[PDB]
């Protein structure tokens, strides 16, 4: 109902960068307030903050294993190379249309 009253891949990636700066701007502004001047009573929240950092924010220990996890990404390019060639299937069929137009002309 609100959609009627108000009224792809690149746009979906635009919201990704907005979430990346959200990770940067939230931690820097908050952490700098606890440290340096005016230390509030804390270390109760700090236990939850560092709970995110343990698990380039995550793990470099899987770098050797990451290449095995990246294999699925390499597999996606195996078929996509033919999928890009599958566009030439219609591209070659559409060549018959214009060639037929030259015959009718």
């Amino acid at each position: 109902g609100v959609e009627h009253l108000l009224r792809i891949r690149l746009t979906n990636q635009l919201k990704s960068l907005k979430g990346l700066q959200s990770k940067l701007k939230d931690v820097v502004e908050y952490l700098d307030k606890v440290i340096n001047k005016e230390l509030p009573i804390n270390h109760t929240i700090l236990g939850k903050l560092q709970d995110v950092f343990n698990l380039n924010n995550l793990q470099k220990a899987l770098t050797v294993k990451t290449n095995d996890e990246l294999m699925v990404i390499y597999i996606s390019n195996l078929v996509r190379s033919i999928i890009a060639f599958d566009d030439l299937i219609e591209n070659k069929i559409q060549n018959k249309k214009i060639q037929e137009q030259r015959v009718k002309d």
Partner: peptide, 20 residues
């Protein structure tokens, strides 16, 4: 896959680049 994969553009551009 790389060997027989090159035949996709090889057989397509063989007689396809000359149109008619």
């Amino acid at each position: 896959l790389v060997k027989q994969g090159d035949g996709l553009l090889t057989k397509l551009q063989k007689y396809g680049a000359a149109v008619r």
